[PDB]
Amino acid sequence: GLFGAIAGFIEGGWQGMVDGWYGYHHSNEQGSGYAADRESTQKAIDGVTNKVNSIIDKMNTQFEAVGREFNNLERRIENLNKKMEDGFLDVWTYNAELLVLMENERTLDFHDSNVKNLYDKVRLQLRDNAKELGNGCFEFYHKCDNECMESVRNGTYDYPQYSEEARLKREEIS
């Protein structure tokens, strides 16, 4: 995709995540589990649904009567009808096929953008209190527990509360 997340530095999706399109996986002392980001998922679901409906609802269908009303001595006019019908089929076939091709690439790159933005949202909270692993994961420096883990997904991560512990852990490795 255009952005680096899906099939990029986040190599593959999560089969263990059945709720939501995007979310988090945590691993700490208490345990490990998945959690869906309902804000990102519902926003994406609404966006894709609008896209499909817009493609469907924008079609203006009219009452037409398509038949063969010309006899043997009117082949030229029948040929005129054939050229008209074939031209419309060529236009609609080409239009529908490439509209699907163009929108599918944009849809897959839409999911890629959403995952990367969610990754950036977490990265903004953590700052130097955690270390980026480069594969979509953050290694904590300050022993983040279950209540701590929720604050990252909530958006309520208390950075100054853990600055001292992370700093002392950062110097230990160095």
């Binding site: 999560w14 995540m17 979310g23 002392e29 089929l89 529908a96 599918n104 690439e105 904590f140 852990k169």
Partner: protein, 321 residues
């Protein structure tokens, strides 16, 4: 040995595939098709109005009253007309119907239709009205069209006809009449006595004068003779003036016609399905909001656009893994 939180995306067991402009055969978690491929395989009503199904007859054969057709029917309204690909019953006596294709388009959608007896056979006291032919059999017996009468000589005389019918009905009237072409001088004198004949029809707009063409012709349905029919729309309070001295196939019935919509003739071999639809094809009916379909090109109604394609699949989920 440090705590970890990760960001990831959904995956499932879906094997659905989509195509992008850069990549082909990409497995996605969810996909939606926008191409219609299903029909009920039946002939339905169009917006609550039943179609006119001619089981074994053409429009010309049904209009003139071929004895092998269904007499008449209690359908005063139809949205479109159904015909088989090769109807068995048509003009049984060989001939032509003028403006047949234009007439078929006129009757494609009809609000009100009613057969009306406008000139009974009793209105022909000086002429014979029992004309029949083997080319128009009924239960193996020679017969004729049930709405137009073969006027022929009686008591060795064919007096000149001066007849006018005024349209007293409140609706438009569709009238059919024909002329007969003989094969030899003896046949003409046999059937109509007078050797030189004509048919003169006149209305507010119509001014016609047909002359029989007596010549050697190939046999069709056994008869070398021909019968060319004509039609017109008699407006209310307008009178049609017939004037002939032979070879005249005089109208006996007519048709009250009210038209406010248009349609076409559908060539389908199916049968009625006691259903309703907004879109009809010769092989079935469609219900759909999808913008495209690949079922049949010869559709009637509000239908998806016809395309050459087997699938139009839109990716709704994520890139699966």
């Amino acid at each position: 040995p440090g705590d970890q939180i990760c960001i990831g995306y959904h995956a499932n067991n879906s094997t659905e595939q989509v195509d992008t402009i850069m990549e082909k055969n990409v497995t996605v978690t969810h996909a939606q098709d926008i191409l219609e491929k299903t029909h009920n395989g039946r002939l339905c009503d169009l917006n609550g109005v039943k179609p006119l199904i001619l089981k074994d007859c053409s429009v010309a054969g049904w209009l003139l009253g071929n004895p092998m057709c269904d007499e008449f029917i209690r359908v005063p309204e139809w949205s479109y007309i159904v015909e088989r690909t090769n109807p068995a019953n048509d003009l049984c006596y060989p001939g032509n119907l003028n403006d047949y294709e234009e007439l078929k388009h006129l009757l494609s959608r009809i609000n009100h239709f009613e057969k009306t007896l406008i000139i009974p056979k009793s209105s022909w006291p000086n002429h014979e009205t029992s004309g029949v032919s083997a080319a128009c059999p009924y239960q193996g017996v020679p017969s004729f069209f049930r709405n137009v009468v073969w006027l022929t000589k009686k008591n060795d005389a064919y007096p000149t006809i001066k007849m006018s019918y005024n349209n007293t009905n409140g609706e438009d009237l569709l009238i059919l009449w024909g002329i007969h072409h003989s094969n030899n001088a003896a046949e003409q004198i046999n059937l109509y006595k007078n050797p030189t004949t004509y048919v003169s029809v006149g209305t507010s707009t119509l001014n016609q004068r047909l002359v029989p063409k007596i010549a050697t012709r190939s046999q069709v349905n056994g008869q070398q003779g021909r019968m060319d029919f004509f039609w017109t729309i008699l407006k209310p309070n307008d009178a049609i003036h017939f004037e002939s001295n032979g070879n005249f196939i005089a109208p006996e019935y007519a048709y009250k016609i009210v038209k406010k919509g248009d349609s076409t003739i559908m060539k389908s071999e199916m049968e009625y399905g006691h259903c309703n639809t907004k879109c009809q094809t010769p092989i079935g009916a469609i219900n759909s909001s999808m913008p495209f379909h690949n079922i049949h090109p010869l559709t009637i109604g509000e239908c998806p656009k016809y395309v050459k394609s087997n699938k139009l699949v839109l990716a709704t989920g994520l890139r699966n893994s």
